[PDB]
Design an enzyme around this catalytic site. Structure first.
Site, short mmCIF file in Angstrom:
data_model
loop_
_atom_site.label_atom_id
_atom_site.label_comp_id
_atom_site.label_asym_id
_atom_site.label_seq_id
_atom_site.Cartn_x
_atom_site.Cartn_y
_atom_site.Cartn_z
N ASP A 297 1.62 4.60 0.77
CA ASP A 297 1.06 5.70 1.55
C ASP A 297 1.35 7.04 0.89
O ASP A 297 2.41 7.25 0.30
CB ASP A 297 1.68 5.68 2.96
N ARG B 53 0.94 -1.11 0.00
CA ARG B 53 0.00 0.00 0.00
C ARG B 53 0.98 1.17 0.00
O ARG B 53 1.75 1.33 0.95
CB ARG B 53 -0.82 0.07 1.29
N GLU C 240 -2.38 5.00 -2.48
CA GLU C 240 -3.33 5.81 -1.72
C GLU C 240 -3.35 7.20 -2.32
O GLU C 240 -2.47 8.02 -2.05
CB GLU C 240 -2.91 5.89 -0.24
N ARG D 276 -11.38 -4.11 0.05
CA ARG D 276 -10.62 -4.11 1.29
C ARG D 276 -11.58 -3.93 2.46
O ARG D 276 -12.42 -3.03 2.47
CB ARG D 276 -9.58 -2.99 1.32
C1 LIG Z 1 -4.00 12.16 6.30
C2 LIG Z 1 -4.02 12.34 4.79
O1 LIG Z 1 -3.70 13.73 4.47
C3 LIG Z 1 -3.68 14.09 3.08
O2 LIG Z 1 -5.02 14.11 2.58
C4 LIG Z 1 -5.43 15.38 2.08
C5 LIG Z 1 -6.13 15.18 0.73
O3 LIG Z 1 -5.24 14.59 -0.20
C6 LIG Z 1 -6.61 16.52 0.17
O4 LIG Z 1 -7.27 16.31 -1.06
C7 LIG Z 1 -7.57 17.20 1.18
O5 LIG Z 1 -8.79 16.49 1.29
C8 LIG Z 1 -9.92 17.34 1.36
C9 LIG Z 1 -10.84 17.06 0.16
O6 LIG Z 1 -10.14 17.30 -1.05
C10 LIG Z 1 -12.09 17.96 0.23
O7 LIG Z 1 -12.98 17.62 -0.83
C11 LIG Z 1 -12.81 17.78 1.60
O8 LIG Z 1 -13.42 16.50 1.65
O9 LIG Z 1 -11.89 17.93 2.70
C12 LIG Z 1 -10.72 17.08 2.67
C13 LIG Z 1 -9.87 17.36 3.92
O10 LIG Z 1 -10.51 16.87 5.07
O11 LIG Z 1 -6.95 17.29 2.48
C14 LIG Z 1 -6.47 16.05 3.05
C15 LIG Z 1 -5.86 16.36 4.44
O12 LIG Z 1 -4.76 17.24 4.34
C16 LIG Z 1 -2.79 13.12 2.24
O13 LIG Z 1 -3.05 13.31 0.86
C17 LIG Z 1 -3.03 11.63 2.59
O14 LIG Z 1 -2.04 10.84 1.96
C18 LIG Z 1 -2.99 11.40 4.11
N1 LIG Z 1 -3.26 9.95 4.41
C19 LIG Z 1 -2.06 9.07 4.61
C20 LIG Z 1 -0.83 9.95 4.85
C21 LIG Z 1 -0.41 10.26 6.10
C22 LIG Z 1 0.82 11.16 6.21
O15 LIG Z 1 2.13 10.67 6.50
C23 LIG Z 1 -1.13 9.73 7.38
O16 LIG Z 1 -1.45 10.87 8.17
C24 LIG Z 1 -1.42 10.62 9.57
O17 LIG Z 1 -0.07 10.73 10.07
C25 LIG Z 1 0.49 12.05 10.20
C26 LIG Z 1 1.93 11.92 10.74
O18 LIG Z 1 1.93 11.36 12.03
C27 LIG Z 1 -0.42 12.87 11.16
O19 LIG Z 1 0.10 14.19 11.36
C28 LIG Z 1 0.48 14.43 12.73
O20 LIG Z 1 1.89 14.71 12.80
C29 LIG Z 1 2.30 15.93 12.15
C30 LIG Z 1 3.82 16.11 12.37
O21 LIG Z 1 4.46 16.38 11.14
C31 LIG Z 1 1.54 17.14 12.77
O22 LIG Z 1 1.91 18.34 12.12
C32 LIG Z 1 0.03 16.91 12.63
O23 LIG Z 1 -0.66 17.98 13.23
C33 LIG Z 1 -0.32 15.60 13.35
O24 LIG Z 1 -1.71 15.33 13.26
C34 LIG Z 1 -1.82 12.97 10.51
O25 LIG Z 1 -2.69 13.72 11.34
C35 LIG Z 1 -2.42 11.56 10.30
O26 LIG Z 1 -3.60 11.68 9.52
C36 LIG Z 1 -2.45 8.90 7.10
O27 LIG Z 1 -2.69 8.01 8.17
C37 LIG Z 1 -2.31 8.10 5.77
O28 LIG Z 1 -3.48 7.31 5.51
#
Ligand SMILES: C[C@H]1O[C@H](O[C@H]2[C@H](O)[C@@H](O)[C@@H](O[C@H]3[C@H](O)[C@@H](O)[C@@H](O)O[C@@H]3CO)O[C@@H]2CO)[C@H](O)[C@@H](O)[C@@H]1N[C@H]1C=C(CO)[C@@H](O[C@H]2O[C@H](CO)[C@@H](O[C@H]3O[C@H](CO)[C@@H](O)[C@H](O)[C@H]3O)[C@H](O)[C@H]2O)[C@H](O)[C@H]1O
Ligand SMILES: *[C@@H]1O[C@H](CO)[C@@H](O)[C@H](O)[C@H]1NC(C)=O
Length: 496
Positions: free
Chosen positions: A197, A195, A233, A337
């Site tokens: 990420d 997967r 992803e 999944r």
């Molecule tokens: C969470 C997702 O954010 C994006 O996802 C974007 C999306 O691509 C964009 O299109 C828009 O979405 C928008 C839609 O477009 C819109 O239509 C509407 O629906 O609202 C959405 C937002 O809610 O924003 C979101 C959020 O930024 C990415 O594109 C996507 O790849 C990602 N998912 C994967 C990646 C990571 C990162 O390593 C992990 O994060 C996960 O681990 C991170 C690291 O520990 C965490 O940060 C943590 O540590 C950081 C330290 O650097 C801190 O700054 C942060 O405050 C803390 O929470 C995060 O909270 C958690 O979710 C996830 O577990 C994993 O599955």
């Protein structure tokens, strides 16, 4: 890339979110293999930052420190033991590969890592890999904060820091090699795929360059020339410059529109109704089925951390959730999944859950073992949705009807629909606020079938509802809006 590499006949993978390696090994042997599950998606098996504030959140595992197989899930010995045992029983292992970045740039230097490895985020120093300042995109990113600020700019989305996470310079062969080295170590151990990420945050071409460095699957378990299954992803709900189709050349992609739309339809939000699912699939603007990895909810969006928001159905909405997963598992679109989670104390304040960071069940940071109760459910706060009768049986339903066409659709112009899969399966749903009682054409051969939702077929007998199919292929279905599970599913193997 595109093929799951699952044992023939098995059509789904389950995400055993935050499970320990030893527990997964046991699960492969005692449940997953016997129940027909195709594989398991494991949480990141590489060393991560140990975060104590908040206390060991689930997301600390998305902040890499090294590629040492040493985490709260277990060490390398335990990991190899798991892959070996699972493979020996025909259940594949898919690794959550966090290759886009390392930990947060603000994390304090020291040995606060799951394996004691030293790391200094401030100076871009990760000696255990090793990586240094030249291995990150700090000089390539053009935003004022250094983080991603605008998703309408496809460039910063790829070169800048996702919420502060140190961004790896994936165009460098050295970095591509350290990542491939890590992935080949796992492939040779025996994993069947990955997967990827945060794939949206990587250039399609950089990902491809890494994949070209990957070995064929371990020849001790897989046929010669087997390539690792790859699912990227990529959250693409439309409206952004980046499209998941740009990643089709590397493998499959997660179709997040799937769960979000199924959620609004099932919740009957703003005019939506199940009768509209007649042309579910590409007909709804989804990616081609042969490039889709679908799901109802994921570890990310079941807690508001991903796209989907409020419409997403999770175990918390048990009744509607089972129906959603049921529809997904019965429909021919994509590769499915299944989620498997743990309970955390949801604390809603002004519409949001303030405890969305809570990590897996633990004793002073030590993840609790998954205990199996006598009714086959789990203890220690693990939800184990994959063990819920309604879900597990639909996992089998998919295996049974694999290959059969989508046929015999029916809908009352509202929320009562039904359809079959060739002459191997038939499913009926009632999501209206009134009873459903009608005779439908099922396409199945005459006989008595066990409803696999309300019960099981246990040696010449059903423990639940029974459906009688006549010579016509017709059968009467009665579903009250008061039923625990307002849907019925029968297939060639639940045939008495
Ligand atoms: C969470 C997702 O954010 C994006 O996802 C974007 C999306 O691509 C964009 O299109 C828009 O979405 C928008 C839609 O477009 C819109 O239509 C509407 O629906 O609202 C959405 C937002 O809610 O924003 C979101 C959020 O930024 C990415 O594109 C996507 O790849 C990602 N998912 C994967 C990646 C990571 C990162 O390593 C992990 O994060 C996960 O681990 C991170 C690291 O520990 C965490 O940060 C943590 O540590 C950081 C330290 O650097 C801190 O700054 C942060 O405050 C803390 O929470 C995060 O909270 C958690 O979710 C996830 O577990 C994993 O599955
Ligand atoms: C099916 O269950 C009934 C009792 O409900 C019993 O009379 C019968 O022997 C069972 N059939 C088989 C094949 O076990």
């Amino acid at each position: 890339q595109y093929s799951p590499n699952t044992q023939q006949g098995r059509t789904s993978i389950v995400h055993l979110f935050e499970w320990r390696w030893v527990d997964i090994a046991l699960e492969c042997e005692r449940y997953l293999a016997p129940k027909g599950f195709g594989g398991v998606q494991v949480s990141p098996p590489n060393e991560n930052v140990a975060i104590y504030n908040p206390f060991r959140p689930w997301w600390e595992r998305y902040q890499p420190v090294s590629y040492k197989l040493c985490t709260r899930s277990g060490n390398e010995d335990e990991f190899r033991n798991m892959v070996t045992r699972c493979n020996n029983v025909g259940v594949r292992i898919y690794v959550d590969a966090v290759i886009n970045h390392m930990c947060g740039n603000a994390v304090s230097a020291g040995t606060s890592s799951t394996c004691g490895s030293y790391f200094n985020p401030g100076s871009r120093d990760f000696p255990a890999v090793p990586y240094s300042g030249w291995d990150f995109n700090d000089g390539k990113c053009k935003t004022g904060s250094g983080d991603i600020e605008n998703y309408n700019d496809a460039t910063q989305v790829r070169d800048c820091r996702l919420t502060g996470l140190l961004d790896l310079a994936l165009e460098k062969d050295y970095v591509r090699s350290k990542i491939a080295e890590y992935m080949n170590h796992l492939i040779d151990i025996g994993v069947a795929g990955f997967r990827l990420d945060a794939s949206k945050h990587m250039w399609p071409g950089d990902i491809k360059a890494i994949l070209d460095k990957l070995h064929n699957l371990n020849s001790n378990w897989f046929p010669a020339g087997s390539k690792p299954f790859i699912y990227q992803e990529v959250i693409d709900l439309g409206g952004e410059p980046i499209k998941s189709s740009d990643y089709f050349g590397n493998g499959r992609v997660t179709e997040f529109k799937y769960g979000a739309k199924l959620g609004t339809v099932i919740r009957k939000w703003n005019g939506e109704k199940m009768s509209y699912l007649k042309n579910w699939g590409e007909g709804w603007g989804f990616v081609p089925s042969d490039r889709a990895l679908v799901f109802v909810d994921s570890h990310d969006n079941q807690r508001g951390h991903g796209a989907g928001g409020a419409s997403i159905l999770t175990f918390w909405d048990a009744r509607l959730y089972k129906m959603a997963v049921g529809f997904m598992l019965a429909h021919p679109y994509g590769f499915t999944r299944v989620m498997s989670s743990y309970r955390w104390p949801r604390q809603f304040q002004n519409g949001n859950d303030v405890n969305d960071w809570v990590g897996p069940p633990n004793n002073n940071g030590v993840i609790k073992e998954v205990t199996i109760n006598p009714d086959t459910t789990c203890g220690n706060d693990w939800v184990c949705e994959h063990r819920w009768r309604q879900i597990r049986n639909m996992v089998i339903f998919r295996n049974v009807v694999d290959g059969q066409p989508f046929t015999n659709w029916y809908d009352n112009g509202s929320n009562q629909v039904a359809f079959g899969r060739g002459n191997r399966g038939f499913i009926v749903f009632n999501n209206d606020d009134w009873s459903f009682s009608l005779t439908l054409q099922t396409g199945l051969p005459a006989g008595t079938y066990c409803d696999v939702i309300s019960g099981d077929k246990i040696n010449g007998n059903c423990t639940g509802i029974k459906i009688y199919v006549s010579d016509d292929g017709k059968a009467h279905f009665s579903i009250s809006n008061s039923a625990e599970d307002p849907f019925i599913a029968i297939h060639a193997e639940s045939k008495l």
